[PDB]
């Protein structure tokens, strides 16, 4: 089973003062979400595309993964992130 | 044949009715079937050996033949005239039961009496290792004796029979070669009576041993079918039963366990605080549910056990908010109308009953240890049972204070016992818990990746998590013990998950480019450490997030493969790093004889 | 605990029974069998 | 023997294998042992008896033997090799596979072609009932036959074939004696080709009926086996299949039904009024839970049914409070916090969906039948089932009114649709309900005098209840119907209770002064009315206070009495008033001698 | 199973208003309780002595029965009554 | 469906089987045997 309801809790709290920091395939981050993959807290890691949880701890340079897709809102913890940034 | 021997009561004619027990004034006698004869030679031969110490010492009373107890009767042999008929035996050996009482009597007299003697030999024997696992080394026997003549106290039975003993000893031991009189050297060979099994225990330098590698290997596939490793990540309903859960009591500290990591617990996350009254023995007390959420043991999802929250070494302020103090702490069940995690204000708890207080205030139970007042260790405890909680949609159990007065003191103390080491004693192994449900069955399958970090380690003693996590350990300690999942071996355990990672792998790169072709290499080396950080975690497999290991291939694909490589192991198992294993022994026999060589120097 | 009769050699309220363990003879069936692969061949 | 016959296919020496079911170009030869014979023969018969009939009219084809459709093979006849080999038929009677299609489809085309004439040559016959049963009773023959030369339509078939079906009915009714043709006159003993039967069938004067007193006998020993009556009051647990549950769905009238009297219905019984709201379809309206305490529909404690209450006929008050006007009349659930009985205010109920809303306000679904606008009959419903109030602790159906806008007027109304007439029907037949519960076997001896004059009559259509009166009333017709439990008899039926009333005062009597001998003139009459009581109105002993019929031992008791007397009652059991019976019989054939008087005066 | 709870709060609501009344075994009515032994409201009537219930009709003239003991308190619910006789 | 062989003498899978209902033969094996007091004897 996808997510584990605790770990979207800790999506929230973590995008509920934004510290969500969203990294591309390069493990780089970046702030657009267009190529961005993994998603952090920085408790769980998730790649936006399958939507499914990674690593339990953060720093998603020693993450293996295989999967390639496109778009998928919600970009609406990213939209929170940011107007929360503030 | 077996059994009770039969004869024709009818006579001549012996049908499946005209037999009948042979019975009689010796009772009834049963057939001695080749390999039972073997056992009551092997124990009587165990004996006879002990011959020069029975006549030393005028007990015993001669060697002891098996064909003293037994006989040559002839009939129909079975368990039952109707089978017993289809096993005619002629001239066969059966013992009468007043017969197979002495040979049990004797054999046990006897046997007391050698055990005795035999204590002594050993204190003696083993006195001086008497067994190296990798060539020889001698220690030139004056010595030795002139040694031992010393060391022995003076109670043991070989300093008064030495050559009465070592007579017994010679046998046991192919260590002592004795001279041979007519030409007074040596033998080269030694000659023990257990010539044989002594030859098969020596740790042949080809591999290990062969009574060790052999049982390591019988004793995991005993394992492997009994428990029910086979089966262990099944997709469908399976009584607790199944998983034969024993001593299972696990202990905690809840007001820490999130109520989402275990839903066994809920927590009174309210605004405010909520002060209730109760009269409890006529004084009247408030339970608190102070500042913080105060998390409390759901009642429902709680398999009727024993809990037992422990109240000690924990802090016990009483110095400063003086509330605290006078109060008896005292496990208590709240039954709330509206449930928890929407009960606001005290008109929301129906009631709450005391179900087990401590007597005396608290300011008794405090003890200095540094300022900061400790608890002197005392066990609070409810006896919680399934139906006493039948309706009643919310009741939870919370270990809390019972302040005899409120106060502004106390406004930010929160007097939630729950910090303690509660210990649930599933009372009733039938009932397991899962996801917060009592049910009879699990899924293995279903707790496979489905806990989180911490879902596991707060799971609720003997709850299918619990059990399918005594499960995976049973299996872990078969792999660990008898497969080689410990070294670059690519062993059957590590090699099950290889071909499922691969038949995985290569349908994900089926439609598409396909430019990758599977690596191999780098698949043998991630199921490796996948088969090993299972023998190595068994849980983890338990846990969302867990490369490999929480696929549902794996682990009903690792268990049947270590399954079939435990029923083929060989003998010579042990081959595996015999190499070092065998060059340790010699650098133990090099050390041993390092020994002998000073017990050879100082009693010259 | 109705008579039977011959089904079986023995009645079980038959004429002077009687229950009397001795710990001489603890009582046993046949359940240690072998069957492992190695022991049974 | 009986089945297929087989032979020795390897010939000579026959096994349990090297036989075969001989079959061939005709297809399997099946052995016709001697009852099956009989059948297939009373079946020809029956058709042989029309053989005037069939020559007349030139179709048929000549009599139908039955030894046209079988043979005389000989082998070994069973339904396995195995059992066949028992049973070696030398020259037996066997019909082939191609055959048993002949004598089917040929007794089936003369079938029709009697059953058609036979049809004829009936509303002929009865038509002037050639049947009494006291005594005799002629009609000169002439004016018989000028009588039915008129009645008889123009298109039966016995005018066209006069003494062409007189031949075939002289052989079915022995009242029409023909006159022998060498002395002119009848022959006093008729004999009609059902000779045996249909002297079987007279109604003998000694006892009613030989084939009626046997019938409703092995009629009430079939429902004895069958449904379960044996077993009725048992004392443990059954499954509701046992109860064979079906075509079983009961209506009420709640909103009357008081709380206490049926678990499964609780009320809001409240100081005001708790208007809540709910937008249903865009529009706001709002639920009442009126002035009264409006009993509603409890969810748990209710098998997922099809509950559908109908509101007809029902008053529909729109005129005095205008408020009720243009409120859609609906069934609608609704959500608690707290317990129900402890709900207060609108703060208190969580949700409310409404379940089935009913298009058009109030005043389209009226009609005025004398002042008075009542409903027209329409049916709101929901469909209820188990798990979708799963968790939900508190939750009840309400048929209401939704107003969509509360005013002073409905201030005293309160809009409870539940005095129409609901009809729930459990779906799903395995659960039943019991005080309250949900389960899946009743305990029968538990549901005896438990439930009140009324806690019966509000029974819930599939609940034990439903189901232990369901079951009684089974019995209760085998008692009814076979046992004489209506006269002063002292049948089987009061007297196994007659039984236990004294066994059970006789022990009540000891220890004491004893100074009152058992009745049992006065016993026997209690356990009479006793029994009489319980064949009337079956239900009765399930009401708590019933004199007698609701003591433990009674029923369990009836029963198996009742079980054992219908084994036994002879044949003859219609002897019973045979006297009356016989009398009132002589009674009928002498009024109509009176008819057949008239046949013979009005048509000389 | 004894009274059926619906029988106790039929009890309670003809002693919230006393109407009651005690019959003694010769049955006639007495409100002395000590040589009564049947209880009505009118609806339901019990023996004081075995307390069962045995008749839901009243006219406890019809009724059969076989017990005898003495000592029954509840007599409250006897005190209940002559107090809101008034 | 897996080849059995001998066990009984038709395989399940075997060669040219065939369901085909015919209003002729309504499928029937022995329910109403009578066994009730006066017709068993
Ligand atoms: C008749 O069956 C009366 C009951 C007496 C024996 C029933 C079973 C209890 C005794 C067991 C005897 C066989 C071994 C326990
Ligand atoms: C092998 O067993 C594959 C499954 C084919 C038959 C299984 C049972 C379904 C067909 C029934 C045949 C016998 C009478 C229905």
């Given at each position: 089973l996808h997510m584990i309801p605790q770990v979207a809790h800790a999506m929230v709290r973590a995008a509920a003062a934004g510290r969500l920091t969203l990294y591309t395939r390069?493990?780089?981050?970046?702030?657009?979400?267009?190529?961005?993959?993994?998603?952090?807290?920085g408790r769980y890691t998730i790649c936006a595309f399958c939507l499914?949880?990674?690593?339990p701890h953060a720093n998603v340079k020693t993450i293996q993964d295989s999967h390639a897709c496109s778009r998928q809102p919600n970009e609406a913890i990213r939209s929170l992130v940011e107007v929360s940034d503030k | 044949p077996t059994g009770k021997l039969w004869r024709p009561v009818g006579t001549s004619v012996a049908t499946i009715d005209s037999l009948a027990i042979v019975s009689d004034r010796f009772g009834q006698y049963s057939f001695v079937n080749e390999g039972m004869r073997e056992t009551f030679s092997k124990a009587l031969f165990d004996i006879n050996m002990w011959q020069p110490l029975f006549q030393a010492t005028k007990t015993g009373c001669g060697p002891i033949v098996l064909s003293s107890f037994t006989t040559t009767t002839s009939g129909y042999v079975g368990a039952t005239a109707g089978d017993a008929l289809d096993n005619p035996v002629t001239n066969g050996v059966f013992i009468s039961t007043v017969q197979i009482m002495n040979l049990q009597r004797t054999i046990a007299a006897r046997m007391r009496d050698v055990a005795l003697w035999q204590k002594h030999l050993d204190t003696a024997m083993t006195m001086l290792t008497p067994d190296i696992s990798a060539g020889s080394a001698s220690c030139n026997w004056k010595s030795l004796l002139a040694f031992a003549k010393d060391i022995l106290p003076l109670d043991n039975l070989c300093l008064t029979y030495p050559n009465e003993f070592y007579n017994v000893a010679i046998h046991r031991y192919p260590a002592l070669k004795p001279g041979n009189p007519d030409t007074k050297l040596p033998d080269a060979q030694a000659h023990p009576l257990g010539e044989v099994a002594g030859a098969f225990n020596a740790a042949t330098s080809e591999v290990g041993s062969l009574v060790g590698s052999s049982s390591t290997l019988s004793q995991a596939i005993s394992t492997m079918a009994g428990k029910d490793l086979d089966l262990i990540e099944a997709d469908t309903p399976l009584p607790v039963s199944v998983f034969t859960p024993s001593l299972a009591p696990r202990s905690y500290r809840p007001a820490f366990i999130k109520p989402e990591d275990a839903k066994w617990?809920?927590?009174?996350?309210?605004?405010?605080?909520?002060?209730?009254?109760?009269?409890?023995?006529?004084?009247?007390?408030?339970?608190?549910?102070?500042?913080?959420?105060?998390?409390?043991?759901?009642?429902?999802?709680?398999?009727?056990?024993?809990?037992?929250?422990?109240?000690?070494?924990?802090?016990?302020?009483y110095?400063?908010?003086?509330?605290?103090?006078?109060?008896?702490?005292?496990?208590?069940?709240?039954?709330?109308?509206?449930?928890?995690?929407?009960?606001?204000?005290?008109?929301?708890?129906?009631?709450?009953?005391?179900?087990?207080?401590?007597?005396?205030?608290?300011?008794?139970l405090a003890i200095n240890v540094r300022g900061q007042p400790r608890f002197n260790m005392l066990h609070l405890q409810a006896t919680f049972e399934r139906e006493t909680i039948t309706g009643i949609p919310y009741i939870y159990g919370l270990g809390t204070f019972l302040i005899p007065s409120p106060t502004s003191s106390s406004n930010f103390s929160n007097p939630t016992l729950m910090d303690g080491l509660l210990?649930?004693?599933?009372?009733?192994?039938?009932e397991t818990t899962y996801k917060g449900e009592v049910v009879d069955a699990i899924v293995p399958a279903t707790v496979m990746a489905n806990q989180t970090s911490e879902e596991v380690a707060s799971a609720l003693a003997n709850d299918a998590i619990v059990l399918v996590s005594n499960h995976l350990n049973k299996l872990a300690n078969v792999v660990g013990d008898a497969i080689p999942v410990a070294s670059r071996t690519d062993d059957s355990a590590t090699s099950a998950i290889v071909s499922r990672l691969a038949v995985q792998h290569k349908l994900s790169q089926?439609?598409?480019?396909?430019?990758?072709?599977?690596?191999?290499?780098?698949?043998?080396?991630?199921?490796?450490?996948?088969?090993?950080?299972?023998?190595?975690?068994?849980?983890?497999?338990?846990?969302?997030?867990?490369?490999?290991?929480?696929?549902?291939?794996?682990?009903?694909?690792?268990?049947?493969?270590?399954?079939?490589?435990?029923?083929?192991?060989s003998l010579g198992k042990g081959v595996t790093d015999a190499s070092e294993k065998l060059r340790a022994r010699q650098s133990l026999t090099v050390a041993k004889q390092a020994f002998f060589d000073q017990i050879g120097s100082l009693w010259p | 605990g109705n008579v039977q009769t011959?089904?079986?050699?023995?009645?079980?309220?038959?004429?002077?029974?009687?229950?009397?363990?001795?710990?001489?003879?603890?009582?046993?069936a046949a359940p240690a069998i072998d069957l492992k692969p190695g022991v049974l061949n």
């Open positions: 390069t493990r780089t981050e970046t702030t657009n979400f267009d190529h961005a993959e993994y998603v952090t807290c499914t949880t990674l690593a | 617990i809920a927590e009174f996350n309210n605004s405010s605080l909520i002060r209730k009254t109760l009269t409890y023995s006529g004084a009247t007390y408030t339970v608190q549910l102070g500042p913080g959420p105060t998390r409390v043991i759901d009642m429902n999802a709680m398999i009727d056990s024993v809990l037992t929250l422990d109240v000690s070494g924990t802090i016990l302020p110095d400063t908010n003086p509330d605290l103090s006078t109060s008896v702490p005292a496990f208590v069940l709240i039954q709330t109308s509206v449930p928890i995690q929407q009960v606001t204000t005290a008109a929301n708890i129906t009631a709450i009953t005391v179900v087990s207080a401590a007597g005396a205030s608290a300011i008794n210990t649930v004693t599933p009372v009733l192994l039938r089926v439609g598409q480019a396909s430019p990758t072709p599977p690596d191999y290499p780098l698949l043998w080396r991630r199921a490796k450490r996948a088969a090993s950080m299972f023998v190595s975690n068994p849980s983890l497999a338990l846990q969302v997030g867990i490369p490999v290991l929480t696929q549902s291939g794996m682990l009903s694909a690792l268990t049947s493969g270590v399954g079939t490589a435990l029923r083929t192991g | 011959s089904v079986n050699t023995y009645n079980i309220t038959g004429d002077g029974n009687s229950f009397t363990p001795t710990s001489d003879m603890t009582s046993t």
